[PDB]
From a paper:
A stilbene O-methyltransferase, SbSOMT, is first shown to be indispensable for pathogen-inducible pterostilbene (3,5-bis-O-methylated) biosynthesis in sorghum (Sorghum bicolor). Whilst SbSOMT shows global structural resemblance to SbCOMT, molecular characterizations illustrate two hydrophobic residues (Ile144/Phe337) crucial for substrate binding orientation leading to 3,5-bis-O-methylations in the A-ring. The catalytic residues of SbSOMT are highly conserved with all reported COMTs, including His282 as the key nucleophile, whereas Asp283, Glu310, and Glu342 collectively charge the basicity or confine His282 in its reactive conformation.
We solved the crystal structure of an SbSOMT-resveratrol-nicotinamide adenine dinucleotide (β-NAD) ternary complex (diffracted to 1.72 Å resolution, Fig. 4d; β-NAD was utilized as an additive to improve crystallization), an SbSOMT-resveratrol binary complex, and two ternary complexes reproduced with pinostilbene or pterostilbene (diffracted at 2.10 and 2.56 Å, respectively). All complexes were in high structural resemblance and depicted as a homodimer with an open conformation. Of the three hydroxyl groups on resveratrol capable of forming hydrogen bonds, only the methyl-accepting 3-OH group (A-ring) formed direct hydrogen bonds to SbSOMT residues, including the catalytic residues His282 (2.80 Å) and Asp283 (3.26 Å). Following 3-O-methylation of resveratrol, the pinostilbene intermediate will need to be dissociated and re-inserted in order to re-position the A-ring for 5-O-methylation to produce pterostilbene.
Author numbering:
A (entry chain A): 15 to 377
B (entry chain B): 16 to 377
The structure:
Amino acid sequence: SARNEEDESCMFALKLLGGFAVPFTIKAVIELGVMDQLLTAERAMSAEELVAAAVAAQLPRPEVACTMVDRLLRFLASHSVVRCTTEVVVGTDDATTTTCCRRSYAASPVCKWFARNGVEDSVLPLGMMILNKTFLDSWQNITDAVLEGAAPFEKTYGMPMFEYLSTNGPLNTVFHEAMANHSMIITKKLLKFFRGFEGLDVLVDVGGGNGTTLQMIRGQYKNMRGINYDLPHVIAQAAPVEGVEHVGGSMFDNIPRGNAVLLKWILHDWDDKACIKILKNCYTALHVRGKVIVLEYVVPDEPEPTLAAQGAFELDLTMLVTFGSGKERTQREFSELAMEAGFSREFKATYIFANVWALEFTK
Amino acid sequence: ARNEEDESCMFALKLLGGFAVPFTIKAVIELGVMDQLLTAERAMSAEELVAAAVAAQLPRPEVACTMVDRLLRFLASHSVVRCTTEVVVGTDDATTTTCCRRSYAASPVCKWFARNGVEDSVLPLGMMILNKTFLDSWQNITDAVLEGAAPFEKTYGMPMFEYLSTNGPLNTVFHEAMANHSMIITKKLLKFFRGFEGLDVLVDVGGGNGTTLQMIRGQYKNMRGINYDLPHVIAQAAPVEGVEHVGGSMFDNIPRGNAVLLKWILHDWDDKACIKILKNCYTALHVRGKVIVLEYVVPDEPEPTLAAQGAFELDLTMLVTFGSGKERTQREFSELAMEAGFSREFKATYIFANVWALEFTK
Ligand SMILES: NC(=O)c1ccc[n+]([C@@H]2O[C@H](COP(=O)([O-])OP(=O)(O)OC[C@H]3O[C@@H](n4cnc5c(N)ncnc54)[C@H](O)[C@@H]3O)[C@@H](O)[C@H]2O)c1
Ligand SMILES: NC(=O)c1ccc[n+]([C@@H]2O[C@H](COP(=O)([O-])OP(=O)(O)OC[C@H]3O[C@@H](n4cnc5c(N)ncnc54)[C@H](O)[C@@H]3O)[C@@H](O)[C@H]2O)c1
Ligand SMILES: COc1cc(O)cc(/C=C/c2ccc(O)cc2)c1
Ligand SMILES: COc1cc(O)cc(/C=C/c2ccc(O)cc2)c1
């Protein structure tokens, strides 16, 4: 609609500067309980009906709350996050932010990924880490961190993230729930789309937590045995799982022996030398023809302006912000690390879901 | 594995990640890399852009280059910069990818981030939009809504204009953003808007040091100006030929003239406060006088266009800053004017960057 190229140029610059407004608006609609009412609603609902349904608490300024929610949802409607219908009101009205007319709102399909059921296959626990204030604050310190060649997180909090989490119980839970949430989704998709668990006697899951992933995998492959390998303090908290041995240890020291080792979102935390050491421990732990299964995004060789590529470079920036030298890798960069660790010139890539690939390297 | 379910999920993650572009552009500006992009003659690698932007010896110069490379690659995937890739005659150590070296050029949009070309930039406004103090309020929307309060006030315990009195650096950031936007809009007004023709006296409510009036008089030499602003702002203004500085509150009175300019005033305020301002404009105006409202105009329905999204984005900015400040539709502006006494006579002239000049007539 801009009146010339100069005008459209200016508005695009403002748009680029303002991209934080959508995520922060979504967070509020979620936290208010409005997004869950949209998701269970049988028809479109006005801001007033959404607030009445979402809030049990008696509000001091209920009319202000309703118009504010109307403004939040109208903004998300402009971004196709929700559907909006407008009707004429016969009467007077003040639980909408316009003269004659009342908006009613329905969830778009994308909204199901924000569900608070948590495991209805939602990414909400991941989203709450993505938009966590403690983590977001690091993004304001990128400049100085680059100048020192440090992680923005380190430059913000004085120390690496994994150290800091030991000192912040609440942030630690947010982080672990996000990890667990993404793990659950990808594990399910793996059992739908990936065939590389066929023929395995023993699978070693590094960073397996309580061993949920191995348990779900054994649900489909009943004769496979699992080793759940994680830090001693994580293993101490792990209840028995049938067919899974919990083993405490550092992946930098050793990996337990097996037919395959699973690394999900491990390598992208670490620089190339650390990755090579992890893959060398995988290599010594495997019998010949054994495999490493890497569950990671793969960035394209060039910066393609696609939805998937943008999300992969967005994850690269998250890694820069969090760890500094943690990073997302191309297929070739993954191949090179594996060959450095001793693996053959034999590469498989199976696309799974949500930008995650299963890359398999073979001894 | 890639279907509608997959696209849906990626879309969800994209919506949650929208902050990454703005934060990355900020870093690239603040490192001085954007300015090197804007003066460059050709695509430059991260290494070249760092060497050119940074005076100091860095402790970890190769880490800094590879980090900038990653920032720029991300911006390339969003079409903010142009990237080309060439095979390294050897082995790099200042690009993230060893085979190959990326070089980058500014896209046209980057001119809007310039630190001082001789043209228009929105960089002072952008520094306000991405200022940490202001951004921190957006993390407090849920509790401010439940209380019916402005997120900003819930975050800092006072109204934004009161807070600026307590934070001189933020006060500068705010005023420079307003002055930047006002400068661009006043020049576009002199280009496109014809409603200053014929006016004896123009009253600029919130006119600061009188720069707007000074510029308009530069084109309309027989017009006189009344620069109306708070006494403390007027105390600081130097004399302006053909302009009288007057101190006061727009809630008490407006100086009389043929036209009153209200730029980004009404959107700070609720309907009751707007009606007070407009009733004061009405009584102040001589007959056939006009209020000239310089605001964004939100469409009647939430259209998914670049311009509409920009207007609802400013709406949420007003929500966050003031709570009850808000963007309006044409109909809502008309209705406030009619409540203040103005006639059923409405003009709208599109100016630039989503701003309209709306005129109401006594
Ligand atoms: N960059 C490196 O090469 C590097 C980094 C850290 C530790 N190490 C080596 O590791 C040994 C132990 O030192 P430490 O206790 O600081 O390191 P650690 O065992 O705590 O390892 C560091 C990080 O790696 C991850 N990790 C380690 N083992 C894991 C496992 N089984 N599952 C999931 N994640 C795991 C965790 O995120 C942890 O914070 C030392 O010999 C040390 O040199 C090497
Ligand atoms: N939106 C609302 O919060 C709301 C609601 C209903 C009524 N009101 C009315 O507004 C009053 C609150 O305002 P206040 O008492 O804090 O006063 P105030 O005028 O001192 O408020 C500060 C702001 O007023 C503006 N201002 C006032 N006169 C100006 C002038 N001549 N030139 C430029 N800018 C000028 C500036 O934007 C300044 O930052 C209420 O007492 C009532 O009259 C406001
Ligand atoms: C914080 O207080 C104020 C007061 C005011 O009068 C205007 C603004 C405008 C902000 C803005 C943000 C994003 C954009 O893309 C374009 C403008 C903010
Ligand atoms: C904070 O530390 C970590 C460690 C880790 O292994 C993964 C992530 C992933 C974040 C992320 C962000 C945005 C998305 O869209 C998708 C994932 C973050």
